[model samples]
Target: YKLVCYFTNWSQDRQEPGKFTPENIDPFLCSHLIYSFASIENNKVIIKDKSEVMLYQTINSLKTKNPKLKILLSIGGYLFGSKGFHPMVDSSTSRLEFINSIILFLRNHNFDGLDVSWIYPDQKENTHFTVLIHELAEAFQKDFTKSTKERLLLTVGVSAGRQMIDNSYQVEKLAKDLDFINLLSFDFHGSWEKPLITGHNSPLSKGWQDRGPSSYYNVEYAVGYWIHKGMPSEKVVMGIPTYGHSFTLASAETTVGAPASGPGAAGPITESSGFLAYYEICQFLKGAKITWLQDQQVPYAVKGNQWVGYDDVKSMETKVQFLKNLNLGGAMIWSIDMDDFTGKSCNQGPYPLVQAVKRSLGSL
Candidate 1:
């Protein structure tokens, strides 16, 4: 199994505690590092700023330390607007042009592969997306020399929602074209859901409630559904979140389906509403009580009205074991920056959660 960690391009600008630059990454920790994201402009993949060029260079330089490490440039993120993709893949001319541009961009930036994280496609565009992947695979296989052969990896980030999966993908066809599919299995529940109650952000199984959307929101159902729909288990990579979803309690109750007033307060370091980095959560819950939901195979902590559900060593170990048992490709952490990389908060050393995962995966 391989370990893949995503590095956000904008994370360098976060506060000292939340900031994570290419320099801060421990290359030895992961087998592959994916840089998120490069934008598409005028049918070409483009880096938005000069600083990104330097970041790319520094990230590639890490290969000096670990030659086996592979770096992939991810294009299009959830927040990056998907207007560019529809036009880029609308026709043979545009599709070929975009594919050629990607090859040039990857070669120029020293990237070993490309990861397409198109937010999603509707029913009409689902077939189009599949066609794009097919053309890309053909181009990648044909354009490589001996030096670049077997070096160019192609991957796509896919949605985990049952409806989205049904409408947005031709899984069997896609599984044949790419190296693996990165299943965004997290974010099962967040602020976007019913704010009147709280739910785990990434539960391994159905929670204690076992009703409403929670029944189908767990990782097990999503992964199993995908495989049942003909996606190869070996080409599936489960994505794990290193952060937690926080919510304010309506009363003193802090169980799985407890009443919630609203989203939790903004994290001091992450500064994102309803979200906290593992490090930030660790500091916030320094003396707080933590609870484990055995049935859900996850954990959460509660302090007063503040309730945050996140993965820790025990939970991560469970999820990693699940991945191994399923014979999946491996685990992919959303963003390394969100983890307790500084080791000052979690009290378990740097990348405590991720280290636990690697250890469970037998990589340590």
Candidate 2:
């Protein structure tokens, strides 16, 4: 019964409405809040962001209001990737020093845990990741000997692809060593693909054209694949993105798997081509032709030649029900800041997407 929300430290740097400081966070909205992309310097945890001091101060207030909320420090991201861990994960002494520093850093900052979000570790690197996690788990267990504190939570952010699921994790060992795994179920289709096409970012079911390996791209298949591969279903925290991928249509076909010319134009707010935060999407929906893919259980909208696929309150509610049926750990948002936190934009209240997820989950 966890509704984990991740908010980026960099969001504050964006202009006005797009700028999201920790103060924008609604403390009661998420069961867990994670601060993203912390770095490892000299085998110790550190925040490279300028807002470091204010972040901790805000975290203190957030916890003061919602005592049950678990706030964690997440290291590594898409940009940071696997190479960032190279300085420490390979060496025994380096790994230990980092682990020791982690415990102290988390406790000092009043963070409840650490989230290792090493993006796409390969075959050989998976073993390194496995070993690092085991040692960290051992240290977290050992720390309780000194004084009674909640054992520091250790969670690994993972890929949804079947290849990465197999290539990247030691599933049984992960289930044993960590509290839960954050399964990133989005990004199955995006503008980055070679032969780009319009597709849902987080589909509940496979598209009709999906076959064999491609069939494994959707949320149901990925979640089942993890369980099928030995990671227990309950330990899998499914990811729900508050954003979507957009593409420019090559033709006016405007259906799922329709050909794409390139990425859709950048949102006025996000300013990143091929992506739209839910708030950005809210404005797009006006006069846009929206289509609900019955098979995938998500929606795609097209206005002129532009196409985008994203989850709304209805789709998010469906996803929550899907996770509940599987009886999994809970839902994890890529970020709450991406949602309509301001409430003025989406007309669905502040954080309507996450609110629906939490409400549907409804107290364990």
Candidate 3:
């Protein structure tokens, strides 16, 4: 199985010291490591800050540890938004310019490939995306055949929601161009929903109690829908979250659909609203009671009014098997920085969840 992990560029500046850096990454645990996210400015690819150059250098240096590692530069992200992309991809001239710029950028940075993490394309802009990717693939082909080095890979991060998938994507067109589609199979539910309720962020199976839109929201449905849309099973890389969603329960009742007041308190170290890394969650579970939602194949824990939905070693193993059974393209973590990289927080040792996934997937 091919394990692809995302390494966020800003993790180096995390409030708590020694958060996560390229040096902390275990290159052997993953086949590819993608650094997110370089941005686009005036139709050209640009790194967000000058310091990012140093980080990029450090990431490429990791190749010494694992020569097999393929590092990619991810362009665009949720924060960069899709507004800028609409204009760049709308016109053929602009699209070609952007594509040319990306090739030059990748070559200069010494990255093996590029991952387009565009937040999304609206229904109207969906066809534009198809054209953009088509052009990119064509450009890559030209550059690759002439270069003695390995060919540059092209991939994209896609939404898992039924509505998002049906409205914002031309699945057949994308399948032909992208090396693999990173299925963001996680974030099935979160505190962002109206009338807050305690829910799992990434469930392998739909809970019996799940209702409304969530009834069909599970990793199974997302992966199956993509395959049904003409995407090759082996071209779909299922995404797994290394973080969890936290909610403040309205009452003592703590079940799948329990009501919630709002987002839970932020981590003292990580400090993100309604979000906690696996390391923080593991420590939380130590002091709180853990409950497994068997039907949904996910786990949760509650203490006082704080409730969290996250994945542990057992859940990760289950997910790896799920991917293998479907003959899909292995697993991809959202960001390696969120995992227990330090080995101290979770007490299960360094890169525990990722190592567990590697074991389940077998060998490399």
Consecutive 10-residue window with the lowest summed lDDT within model 2: 10-19
lDDT of 2 by residue, 1-364 (tens): 8888889988887774578999999989988899997998988888998999999999999999988889999998899988899888879999999998999899999999999988978796898888999998989988977758899999988999999878988889989998998999999998888778888888999999988878988999989988887888889999999999999999979988899989999999889999999989999999898989899999999999899999998898899989989988999999899998888788988888998898889945
For candidate 1, the per-residue lDDT at 199 reads 87
Native-referenced Cα lDDT, model 1: 0.84
Rank by lDDT (best first): 2, 3, 1
Q: Write the per-residue lDDT of candidate 1 for residues 116-220, one digit (tens) a residue.
A: 887887586787778888888888888775353465799998888888899988888888888988888888887667656888889999876787755889999
Report per-prediction Cα RMSD to one decimal.
Answer: 1.8, 1.1, 1.6
Residue 305, model 3: Cα distance from true site in angstroms: 0.1
Whose lDDT is higher: candidate 1's or candidate 2's? 2
Segments in model 2 whose C-alpha atoms lie over 4 Å from true places:
none
Worst 10 residues of 1 by lDDT: 143-152
TM accuracy, model 1: 0.95
| TM per prediction | 0.95, 0.98, 0.96
Per-candidate local distance difference test: 0.84, 0.90, 0.85
Q: lDDT tens string, model 3, 130-183?
A: 788888988998998998888789999889888889988989989989999888
Rank ordering of all candidates by TM-score, starting from the highest: 2, 3, 1
